[PDB]
Write a protein that binds this ligand. Structure first.
Ligand SMILES: NC(=O)CC[C@H](N)C(=O)O
Ligand SMILES: [Mg+2]
Ligand SMILES: [Zn+2]
Lengths: 91, 478, 410
């Protein structure tokens, strides 16, 4: 599978691959795609996709729950300002 | 010698004041100090903090009153780091308790540390911890399994008596097998996934390691049950497992999947398993061959579903709200892509790429959707087999604990560790790994897969087996 | 004209719930940044979504009010993209298997005729947060992240800029009448992206589609469309081809602009959220919401014409601004003189409040006071001339009509 393929998928996934990773992931992924290509053999027309059993959809009343304290909400932030998460400008 | 005692022995001593919570912690702390340099079970040891929390612990009738408990470092403990053994999450201080940790704390337990793992719980050996490998206490040249490596190991050396792990495709069971310890993953939906750093939401379940079946049954009872913070958690009452393990049910039946005969086993494992079954036969279990015509497809099915859900669930690690952020970047795109390439390990990166392919339009139908269909076929095999039989047995693992570096060459060789473990996650079934023999110095696990909601039976047979075979006496590292 | 404008709209409507879609944090406007926030709606590790019942109830009511078929099973899917105002890396909405389908809104056109615009889908989804730009940085408030939205998609049935606006106004009024959303673009409770192609008149094929994003008032969508239709007609008649892209509208220039960034969208990698079971809507619940539907604009319109003998001019005013109709009816209740009350409401009070800048919900003249004043005019206690003098002061002060009659002699 192509280099072009590896980059395209990396992009969608927001991984800037280092050049060493690009070559390694070409083989490993090619191998894994062969490894997992077993399922064509099976007929799955007329099979419903898997979902766990359940009688009703679990829903919740429209009542407020105490929010997280803003201090704890922000403490892990790489950069914060005046109550805002701070990132490099987006256009 | 205290850390050498079970939770029944410890409880009676704590309830009658013969010992205090602080001493219990001190005991396991010392054993920790004896072993840790060799083993490396923990990312963040919290015996220090547990010591202090012990002083204020007073009500003795709490079900886990003075009990130390290790916790896998993908389960959130508030105020302390939750790393998922990732660079992208080192220095992430957890802002809330996972529901299980809330329930353990309320039960008197004492969290004694955060346990090493494969990064984001992806792997079968713990080698993919971004920090350091945990080592098998029965042979430090050998892997303790994965991804709950440290939680198994620490229970094996008895640096803690009981432990929490998670199981997406065998991550409790296989470690339990390799470290010669009991490990259970309950029915999907039995334990909340609130505060469990999600890998594959449709497969993940927190579970328990222990050395005695009662230890395991109690910790599971405490952490199980409905959680409003979790939509997938079942509104089903928790059975009184501590009172149920000791009971004996007549005329139970064990299925031996015919399709498992074709699976390459190590002779030692084969021998150990055959003996486990013969000895069970002698005790009055009826032994029947069953069919699961689709099981052989479990691995490819799993390695489509898991990576898929994983690419979705790991989309959030981005350098915006928490955790690691790359130092150099010219735009938000680079910030994103660099933070992630640098913060994520290689196994994790591999499943992210694979996932976002399997979900891509044009391939979704042939990959994820297809797999979710085959997954129902596999589930159905089980439901039908369970019409004839009560539990399904096999080895937990095709091999004995393998060596470091042995399955890092081709990532695939790592996946093949899971061949007997992943079917239970696919079908959403409970499954236990119990120690059945020691072969060439190394533990061997026997696996029992149960019906949905039938953790009782799995636990009962585990209790019967330990009476015949007292694996809890085999203590590694002197 | 040789051509024809084919116009479709994609509307996001904010549901007037107390709570967010997937957690118990408050929905409210202009709070302190990042205060109404969660592990869930912050996209924190280990955090799980829980569906809001009322959001679901409101979205069903909306669907029915839009004459849609409501499907008893729909599924939340994960829509994936990377953006600072989007915590999880994905938005939870619906895709294949949305809540509602196959509906219509009826427009009343200013030349007398009634037209239909089809609703292609109504689905439930959650909002992202808001970015603020400041220097070389973007500041992120996730107060709005996870707020319940109805995404409403139109078939390309709209033909005219005015019709686009008239559509939006009718949708807003249905939403408001149903009581599901405040739906004012001012507070961003209603967003609207526009799709537009042109077509030789009477042709059945579709032309190349241009998208216009972030227009911010109903007036601005008419303006954007007005210009864009002309823009595209110019292109095609000069011998050019109209190119498929997204554009922006500047209110100040009244023009639409291409974008400097040639940034293609990316596969959303849709699939059912494994954190949520399918949304199963009992038929008995649809039946119940159907039975208890509040009164809607088209229904109210015919009712006033009948029940009160109003003219289509009169009823239209009272119905297009619900609170005016509400005022009228609470007034007619105190004194059963409808013809007189609509007169003094429309011709007198409304313009008096407009001039002070006060909304009818908050007027000093309560329905009781207008009914009382009109009573004095009918019973010949005061003259029309004196009545127009006391109404001015009623607005000015807040005193009853009979209060100021006595204070100044009858
Ligand atoms: C647990 O259980 C998960 C095990 C699986 N082989 C993985 O690495 O993802
Ligand atoms: Mg939308
Ligand atoms: Zn919230």
């Amino acid at each position: 599978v192509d280099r072009e393929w590896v980059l395209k998928i990396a992009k969608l996934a927001r991984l800037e691959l280092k050049e060493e990773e690009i070559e390694v992931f070409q083989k490993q992924l090619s191998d894994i795609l062969d490894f997992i290509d077993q399922l064509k053999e099976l007929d799955t027309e007329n099979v419903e996709p898997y979902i766990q059993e359940f009688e009703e959809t679990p829903m919740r009343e429209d009542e407020p729950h105490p929010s997280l304290d803003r201090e704890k909400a922000l403490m892990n932030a790489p950069e914060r300002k005046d109550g805002f998460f701070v990132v490099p400008r987006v256009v | 010698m205290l850390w050498k005692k079970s939770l029944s022995e410890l409880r009676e001593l704590l309830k009658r004041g013969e010992v205090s919570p602080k001493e219990v912690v001190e005991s396991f702390y010392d054993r920790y100090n004896q072993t840790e340099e060799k083993v490396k079970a923990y990312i963040t040891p919290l015996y220090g903090k547990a010591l202090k929390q012990a002083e204020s612990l007073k009500e003795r009738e709490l079900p886990l009153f003075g009990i130390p408990i290790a916790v896998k470092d993908n389960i959130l403990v508030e105020g302390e780091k939750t790393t998922c053994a990732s660079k992208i999450l080192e220095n992430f201080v957890a802002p809330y308790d996972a529901t299980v940790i809330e329930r353990l704390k309320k039960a008197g337990a004492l969290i004694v540390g955060k346990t090493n793992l494969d990064e984001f719980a992806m792997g079968s050996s713990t080698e993919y911890s971004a920090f350091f490998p945990t080592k098998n206490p029965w042979d430090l040249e050998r892997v303790p399994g994965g991804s709950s490596g440290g939680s198994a190991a620490s229970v094996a050396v008895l640096s803690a008596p009981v432990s929490l792990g998670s199981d997406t495709g065998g991550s409790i069971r296989q470690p339990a097998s390799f470290c010669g310890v009991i490990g259970i993953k309950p029915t999907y939906g039995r334990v909340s996934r609130y505060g469990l750093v999600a890998f594959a939401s449709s497969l993940d379940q927190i579970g328990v390691f222990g050395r005695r079946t009662e230890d395991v049954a109690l910790v599971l009872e405490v952490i199980s049950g409905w959680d409003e913070k979790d939509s997938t958690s079942a509104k089903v009452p928790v059975p009184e497992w501590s009172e149920e393990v000791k009971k004996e049910v007549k005329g139970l039946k064990i299925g031996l999947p015919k399709e498992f005969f074709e699976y390459e086993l190590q002779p030692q494992v084969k021998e150990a398993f055959e003996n486990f079954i013969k000895e069970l036969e002698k005790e009055g279990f009826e032994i029947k061959e069953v069919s699961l015509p689709h099981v052989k497809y479990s691995i490819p099915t799993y390695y489509i579903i898991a990576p898929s859900e994983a690419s979705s669930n790991l989309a959030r690690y981005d350098g915006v709200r928490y955790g690691y952020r790359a130092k150099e970047y010219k735009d938000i795109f680079e910030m994103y892509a660099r933070t992630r390439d640098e913060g994520f390990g290689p196994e994790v990166k591999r499943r992210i790429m694979l996932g976002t392919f399997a979900l891509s339009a044009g391939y979704y139908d042939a990959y994820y959707l297809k797999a979710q269909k085959v997954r129902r076929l596999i589930t159905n095999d089980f439901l039908k087999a369970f019409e004839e039989v009560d539990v399904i047995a096999s080895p937990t693992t095709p091999t004995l604990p393998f060596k470091f570096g042995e399955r890092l060459e081709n990532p695939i060789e790592m996946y093949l560790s899971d061949i007997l473990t992943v079917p239970a996650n696919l079908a959403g079934l409970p499954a236990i790994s119990i120690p059945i023999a020691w072969k060439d110095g190394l533990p061997v696990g026997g696996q029992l897969i149960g019906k949905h909601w039938d953790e009782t039976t799995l636990l009962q047979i585990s209790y019967l087996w330990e009476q015949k075979f007292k694996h809890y006496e085999k203590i590694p590292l002197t | 004209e040789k051509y024809e404008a084919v116009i479709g709209l994609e509307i996001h409507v904010q549901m007037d719930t107390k709570t967010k879609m997937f957690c118990g944090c408050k929905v409210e406007f202009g709070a302190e940044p990042n205060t109404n926030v969660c592990p869930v709606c912050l996209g924190m590790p280990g955090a799980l979504p829980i569906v809001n019942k009322r959001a679901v109830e409101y979205a069903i009511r909306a669907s029915l009010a839009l004459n849609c078929e409501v499907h008893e099973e729909s599924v939340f899917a994960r829509k994936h993209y990377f953006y600072p105002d989007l915590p999880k890396g994905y938005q939870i909405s619906q895709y294949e298997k949305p809540l509602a389908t196959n509906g219509w809104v009826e427009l009343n056109l200013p030349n007398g005729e009634k037209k239909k615009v089809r609703i292609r889908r109504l689905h439930i989804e959650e909002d992202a947060g808001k970015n603020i730009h400041e220097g070389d940085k973007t500041l992120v408030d996730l107060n709005r992240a996870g707020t319940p939205l109805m995404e409403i998609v139109t078939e390309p049935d709209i033909r005219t800029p005015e019709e686009a606006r008239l559509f939006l106004e009718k949708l807003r009024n249905i939403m408001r009448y149903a009581g599901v959303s405040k739906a004012d673009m001012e507070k961003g409770q209603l967003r609207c992206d526009i799709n537009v192609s042109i077509r030789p008149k009477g042709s059945k094929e579709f032309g190349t589609r241009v998208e216009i994003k972030n227009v911010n008032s109903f007036r601005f969508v008419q303006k954007a469309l007005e210009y864009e239709i002309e823009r595209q007609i110019n292109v095609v008649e000069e011998g050019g081809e109209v190119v498929q892209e997204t554009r922006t509208f500047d209110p100040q220039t009244g023009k639409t602009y291409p974008m400097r960034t040639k940034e293609e969208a990316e596969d959303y990698r849709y699939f059912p959220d494994p954190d949520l079971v399918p949304l199963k809507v009992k038929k008995e619940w649809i039946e119940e919401i159907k039975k208890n539907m509040p009164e809607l604009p088209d229904q109210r319109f015919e009712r006033l014409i009948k029940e009160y003998g109003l003219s289509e001019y009169e009823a239209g005013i009272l119905v297009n601004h619900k609170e005016v109709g509400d005022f009228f009816e609470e007034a007619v209740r105190h004194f059963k003189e409808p013809k007189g009350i609509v007169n003094w409401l429309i011709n007198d009070l409304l313009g008096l409040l407009r001039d002070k800048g006060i909304s009818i919900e908050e007027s000093p003249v309560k329905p009781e006071h207008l009914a009382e004043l009109v009573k004095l005019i009918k019973e010949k206690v005061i003259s029309t001339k004196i009545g127009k003098e006391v109404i001015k002061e009623m607005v000015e002060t807040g005193k009853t009509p009979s209060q100021i009659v006595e204070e100044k002699g009858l």
